[PDB]
Design a protein around this nucleic acid. Structure first.
Lengths: 126, 169, 137, 48, 72
RNA sequence: UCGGUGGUCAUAGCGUUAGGGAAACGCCCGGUUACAUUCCGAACCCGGAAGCUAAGCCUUUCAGCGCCGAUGGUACUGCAGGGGGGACCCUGUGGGAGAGUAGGACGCCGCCGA
RNA sequence: AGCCAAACUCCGAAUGCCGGUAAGUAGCGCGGCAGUGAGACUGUGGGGGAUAAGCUCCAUGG
RNA sequence: UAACUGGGGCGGUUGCCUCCUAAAGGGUAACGGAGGCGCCCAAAGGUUCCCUCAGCCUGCAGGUGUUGAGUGUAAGUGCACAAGGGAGCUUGACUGUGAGACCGACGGGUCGAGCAGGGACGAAAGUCGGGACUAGUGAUCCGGCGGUGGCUUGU
C-alpha cells in the first residue's frame, strides 16, 4: 500500500518492519496463477498463508497454531519445517503449483530460508 | 562476571527507586540504556594525523573501536568541507557500559582538578545527562560524556544518577 | 512615495481591468473610506498627492490608511524611438483598482472635516469616487 | 579531455566497442568484460 | 536577450478512457510520472506509458496515485 | 471476541479521556555457534518463556486542531443580441463555480487463523 | 484582521478535444492537372505600443 | 563580399533544452518576458539489501519534524513506496531482432512487448539494451583506420 510513517523509540521495530514490508510489496503482487506466499515471523511461531491479492481471498494457510505443530520437540528453525510442509500440501490440494515468495519485511535467513526450503521441496516452484 | 554497578543496580537500586517514586510496574523503573563518549577534533581539518592518536586513546579508555565521523556539512568559517573526518565516538552498551561507568565514577572523576562536584543542571530535559571532560589524563583533548537513560524527565534520571553515586553539586 | 523594495519580474503585462473587486469593498480600519466607482490605474504619485491632501487638511489627530499599494510596473520606451527592439524599462508603479475597491481610509472625530478631507483627496484621483461610512455590522 | 577508446580482448583481435573515459581520472589503460560476438563468450576487453 | 524557445514536444494523453488499444500502443507521453503505470501498462525509458496487452484504456486511483489501466 | 493480510486513502488523521492480556502479539531476559555493527547482540540473526500489561497494539470519551460539506445565490461562460466617446458595461437562452453558511465526521468494506 | 500576482495555486467551470453509441443529412484510398504561399476589415480572447493608430503580431468566427 | 529587420545602415540574432505569453487536448507569432547547452560520471551505470531529510528546541545525545532538504548540471513534470542517503557484488555503458504505436511536409526524432545468444545481481519473483525525464550536437560527398573474404576485363 502507501507506506507507513516512521516511529520513535518503541514501535520502531514495528514501523521499520512494516515499512520494509511495503518495500517488498511494490514488486510482489498476488496474482491468480501464482498467489502471494506471505510469511509472518513472530517471537513464538511462524505463520505462512497463500493470499490472492487480485481477488483479496486467501487460498491456503498454515501456522504453529495447528495441531501438527502446536506442542512438540525442536527449536524454531526446525519448527518451521512442519509449517513449510503443510502449507505446501494445502497449496497443492487447492490447485497451486507456482507461487511468489515474499519475505514479509524481515530478512531471508534462518527460519525464512528454512521455511522456504521446506515448502520448496514439497513441489512448489519459487 | 556481572559488573559491580550492574549488580548493585539489579538488587538495591531498582527497589529503592520504585519505593521513592511509588511505581506500579517494575519495568517502568528507569535504567541505563547506553553510554556514548564523544570527541571532536575540529583541528583535524588542518592535520589528519591528529585523529589517529585520538583512535588510540579512545580505544584504550573504553575497549571498543571508535567510529570516525565525517563532516556532514561544509562550513566556510571553520573552512570545513563535507566528507572529511572531524571526530570519533563510541557507543557502549551492556556490561562494557557498566564496567566503564564504574571506572570513571570511582577512579577518574575525583581526579578533576579542584573538583567540588559536577553540576546537577546539565540534564537535557528528558532524563539524559551530559558532562564534558577538559583533559584526557584523567584516566589511569576534551571528550564529552553523554549518559542516556530510560528516564522520562530530569528528576527521575537525576534520582537514578544520585543513587548510582555521581557527585552532584 | 511608495515603491516595492523588491519585485520578482521588472517587466509585466498590463493588469486587466474587467470585473469588480475581489475584496476590500468595505471599510476595514478607519471610520470613513474612498470607494472607487470606475476602473483605473492609480500611480504612486497619485496616491501620494491624495495622502498629503487628507493629512494636510486635518492638520493633526486622525489616522489615514492606504489600502492599496502601487506594485505593478508599467513600462515606457525612450522618446522618439521606432517600434520594436524589446520592451521598455519600468517607469510608473500602479495599483490596479477596480470598481468597489475602498482605496483610502480615515478616522476623525469631526465628521464634516473628515468628509472635506476625503473630498479633497478624491479630486487628486483619476476615477469617480464615493465616500463610505463604516457599517455597524 | 575525454577521448574515444576502442576496447579489444586478447583472442578475437576485432575492435568491438568504443566508449568515453576521462584520461586524467583513469590514466591506467581501462579494462572490462563484454560479449565478443566472434568468440561468443564473456571475455575481457583490454583498452587498446 | 530574450527570444529563445524550444520547439514543442507534443506531450499529453494519447489514448483516453474507453478507447480500445492494441498491445504496445502509446497511451501517454509525459515528463516524470504524472500518471503511474497500472495493470497491463508499462513505463518506458522517458516516462512513456504504453499498453502491454490489448484492451480498453481506463484511468483510476490505485494505492493513492493516479494510474492508467488496460481492461482486456 | 482477538491475531495476519488486503481495498478505499484523514468523514479514517492528530490530540485528549477511561481501560484490556483466555489463546494470540509484544515487551522481555541470553549470545554457544551461523550472521552483523562506518563502534555497540540498540538494529539484523540465533535459542528459550523468568516477570508484564508500563509502552507498542486493541478498545473507549470528547467536534478541541485538522478533514469532508450541501441547497440557494453570485462570479464566469457557449450561442444570440443591446449600450458606451473610450477603458468597458448589460441582457435572452443553455451550462455554472470558488469562498461562505446549515451541517457531517473520533472511519468503512473483504479474506483467512485462534 | 483587510489585500495583489503571465512565469503563485488549497480549488476550478463554460467551451473545446479524444473515443463509443442512437437519430438525422458529404468522407476515404489510388492516380492526371493545377493555382495559392503580399491578405483586408469587423466580433471575441491576448502580446508589443502609451489603459494610442484605418498600427503590428497571434488564436477563434463572419 | 548572407539573411532577419515596423525603410535601409549601425547594434543584435541565426542550432538544441525548460518555463510564461498559449485563450484547462495538441499546435500557435513578434528585434515578446526569464534562463541554460556544445558537457560530466569507470560510477554520479546494473542489481540485492538497508536508512530517512531540512528546519526547530534542549543539554555528540535526546524530543519534534511527511516533505518545506536532496535530486552532477537551467527550468518544469516527478520523486518520502523514494528516482534522496549507505554498503555487498559486478559491467546490460551487451550481440541478433522489433509485435505494435506517438510526433513531423519530408529527411527524420521517440517509446517499445516478446524471443534467441551469452552474462550481472537476487534464494526467488524478477530487473539490467547507460544515467529520474526532457538539451550536451551536424545530412550527404570525400577520405583514414581495424575486421571479413564478396567481386570487375584471358587465366
Amino acid at each position: 500500500a502507501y507506506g507507513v510513517k516512521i516511529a520513535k523509540g518503541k514501535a520502531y521495530k514495528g514501523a521499520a518492519l512494516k515499512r520494509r514490508h511495503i518495500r517488498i510489496r511494490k514488486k510482489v503482487s498476488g496474482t491468480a496463477e501464482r498467489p502471494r506466499l506471505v510469511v509472518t515471523r513472530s517471537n513464538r511461531g511462524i505463520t505462512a498463508q497463500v493470499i490472492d491479492d487480485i481477488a483479496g481471498h486467501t487460498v491456503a494457510s498454515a501456522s504453529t497454531l495447528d495441531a501438527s505443530i502446536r506442542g512438540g520437540e525442536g527449536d524454531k528453525s526446525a519448527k518451521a519445517q512442519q509449517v513449510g510442509k503443510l502449507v505446501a500440501e494445502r497449496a497443492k490440494a487447492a490447485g497451486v503449483e507456482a507461487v511468489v515468495f515474499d519475505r514479509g519485511g524481515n530478512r531471508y535467513a534462518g527460519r525464512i530460508a528454512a521455511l522456504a526450503d521446506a515448502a520448496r521441496e514439497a513441489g512448489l516452484k519459487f | 562476571t556481572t559488573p559491580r554497578l550492574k549488580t548493585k543496580y539489579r538488587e538495591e537500586i531498582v527497589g529503592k527507586l520504585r519505593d521513592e517514586f511509588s511505581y506500579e510496574n517494575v519495568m517502568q523503573v528507569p535504567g541505563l540504556v547506553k553510554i556514548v563518549v564523544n570527541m571532536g577534533v575540529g583541528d583535524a581539518a588542518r592535520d589528519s594525523k591528529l585523529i589517529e592518536g585520538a583512535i588510540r586513546d579512545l580505544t584504550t579508555i573504553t575497549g571498543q573501536k571508535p567510529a570516525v565521523t565525517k563532516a556532514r556539512k561544509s562550513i566556510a568559517q571553520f573552512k570545513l568541507r563535507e566528507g572529511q573526518p572531524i571526530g570519533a565516538h563510541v557507543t557502549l552498551r551492556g556490561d562494557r557500559m557498566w564496567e566503564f561507568l564504574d571506572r570513571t565514577l570511582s577512579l577518574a572523576l575525583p581526579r578533576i582538578r579542584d573538583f567540588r562536584g559536577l553540576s546537577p543542571k546539565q540534564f537535557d530535559g528528558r532524563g539524559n545527562y551530559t558532562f564534558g571532560l577538559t583533559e584526557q589524563v584523567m584516566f589511569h583533548r576534551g571528550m564529552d560524556i553523554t549518559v542516556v537513560t530510560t528516564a522520562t524527565n530530569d528528576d527521575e534520571g537525576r534520582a537514578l544518577l544520585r543513587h548510582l553515586g555521581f557527585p552532584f553539586k | 512615495m511608495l515603491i516595492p523594495r523588491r519585485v520578482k519580474h521588472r517587466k509585466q503585462h498590463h493588469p486587466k481591468r474587467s470585473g469588480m473587486s475581489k475584496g476590500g469593498t468595505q471599510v476595514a480600519f478607519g471610520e470613513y473610506g474612498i470607494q472607487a466607482l470606475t476602473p483605473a490605474y492609480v500611480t504612486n504619485r497619485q496616491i501620494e498627492a491624495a495622502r498629503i491632501a487628507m493629512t494636510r487638511h486635518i492638520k493633526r489627530g486622525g489616522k489615514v490608511w492606504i489600502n492599496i499599494y502601487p506594485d505593478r510596473p508599467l513600462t515606457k520606451k525612450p522618446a522618439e524611438t521606432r517600434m520594436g527592439s524589446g520592451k521598455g524599462s519600468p517607469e510608473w508603479w500602479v495599483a490596479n483598482v477596480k470598481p468597489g475597491r475602498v482605496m483610502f481610509e480615515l478616522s476623525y472625530p469631526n465628521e464634516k472635516i473628515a468628509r472635506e478631507a476625503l473630498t479633497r483627496a478624491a479630486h487628486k484621483l483619476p476615477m469617480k469616487c464615493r465616500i463610505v461610512r463604516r457599517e455597524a455590522g | 579531455v575525454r577521448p574515444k577508446i576502442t576496447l579489444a580482448c586478447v583472442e578475437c583481435k576485432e575492435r568491438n566497442y568504443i566508449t568515453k573515459k576521462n584520461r586524467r581520472n583513469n590514466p591506467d589503460r581501462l579494462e572490462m568484460k563484454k560479449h565478443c560476438p566472434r568468440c561468443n563468450a564473456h571475455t575481457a576487453h583490454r583498452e587498446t | 536577450r530574450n527570444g529563445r524557445d524550444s520547439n514543442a514536444q507534443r506531450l499529453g494523453v494519447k489514448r483516453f478512457g474507453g478507447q480500445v488499444v492494441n498491445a504496445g500502443e502509446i497511451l501517454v507521453r509525459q515528463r516524470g510520472t504524472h500518471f503511474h503505470p497500472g495493470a497491463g501498462v508499462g513505463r518506458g525509458g522517458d516516462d512513456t506509458l504504453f499498453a502491454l496487452q490489448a484492451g480498453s484504456v481506463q484511468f483510476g486511483t490505485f494505492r493513492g496515485r493516479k494510474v492508467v489501466n488496460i481492461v482486456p
